[PDB]
Amino acid sequence: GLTQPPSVSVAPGQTARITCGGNNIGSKSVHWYQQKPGQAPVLVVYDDSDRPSGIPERFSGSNSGNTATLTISRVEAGDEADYYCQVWDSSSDHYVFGTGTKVTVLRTVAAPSVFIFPPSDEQLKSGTASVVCLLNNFYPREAKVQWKVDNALQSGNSQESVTEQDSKDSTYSLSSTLTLSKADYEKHKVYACEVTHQGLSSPVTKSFNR
Amino acid sequence: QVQLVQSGAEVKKPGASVKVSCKASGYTFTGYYMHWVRQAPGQGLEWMGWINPNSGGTNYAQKFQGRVTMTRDTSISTAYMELSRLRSDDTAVYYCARSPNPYYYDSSGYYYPGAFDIWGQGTMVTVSSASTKGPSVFPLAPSSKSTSGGTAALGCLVKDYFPEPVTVSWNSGALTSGVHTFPAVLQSSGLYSLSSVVTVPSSSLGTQTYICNVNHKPSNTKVDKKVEP
Ligand code: NA
């Protein structure tokens, strides 16, 4: 119910500023929560500007008019998280959370290490074939993974998932799974994933000839 | 110190109900309000309501009134949240979180709007008509196609299970560094699939054994799979 920018990007050492928009929000107490991937939210700032014990002085807050602001000075990789502002609304007796802001920490571009895995014989025996393409520790997030079977582009038969920014080196990893029936898998010989990324001077292909 | 520990993951059919517990330890249970906040996968935080553990009084968010019930057991310092008539969009992680009540309890008719300074680990609740299913675990064998400059990649494919979550460890927890366990994706079959990978030195691929340990509690499925080159 409170307005936050979906994303804020900042280089290490720079200052990140996350805004929390709400009509006359300055007349309310604003609290801020940090939620790292896969973890519970952690209180970082309460009552506009007060900090719980254990939270670094790099975190500061302000609130006036129609904008509250969480300021993170000297941003580092450990600051990668979603940040939620919060307010108690006396007029409605509800706690209201902001829509959340993901802080991404910039770093130097890093090309993915590409690996490829054929399906196991045990899975093959069950009548399906899954082949996996792994892109390890790359930056930035934007990457293109194309499956090729006997040089032919595949569509609709693959899914991928990407990890959030690593808390130490600010990189991502990606896993793409190509799935066919064992019958369709046996019709063809060459299985390849072709990855495109900023850290790659040109696209790179990993393959196996079955 | 001070922590909030919630119960394990739950699977329910639509129309059914679910009850999550939240055990408090390290402080005076009746001293702090206990809130419930949920979060749908990839979405924001949504406040459900609070209970005053001392009086038992409650305040439910409008969206859940007539559907949610918050209770407590002071003797074991545990708070409870029950959501009835579940629908698929109730699928979320459910957190408990405390807020200070300096007026505990020489006052009434007044709520102190404190911050949520301590949160539980969260409880995943899936609401679906689909059947609970244990995963098949297949090895992701290391090879020359998975080596780079002295390091090799291997892993496990945890396929066709329902519902979330599964836990994956390596060598019974001994191996932790260089592990990437990816977010599960929902397949067109309605079943989840996930991969866990580990980057290890290639020189050890002959002299070291790697086993992934998969535990899918909702189906009581425990699988150990040896990953061989
Ligand atoms: Na539970």
Numbering used by the authors:
A (entry chain D): 3 to 212
B (entry chain A): 1 to 229
Give verbatim lines from the article.
A generic approach to assemble two different heavy and two different light chains into a bivalent, bispecific IgG antibody (“CrossMab”) without artificial linkers was recently reported. Correct pairing of two different LCs with their respective HCs is achieved by a CH1-CL-domain crossover in one of the Fabs. To reveal potential structural effects of the crossover procedure on the resulting bispecific antibodies, we report the crystal structure of a human Angiopoietin 2 (hAng2) binding “CrossFab”, i.e. a Fab derivative in which the VL domain is fused to the CH1 domain, while the VH domain is fused to the CL domain (“CH1-CL crossover” in). For comparison, we also determined the crystal structure of the corresponding “uncrossed” Fab.
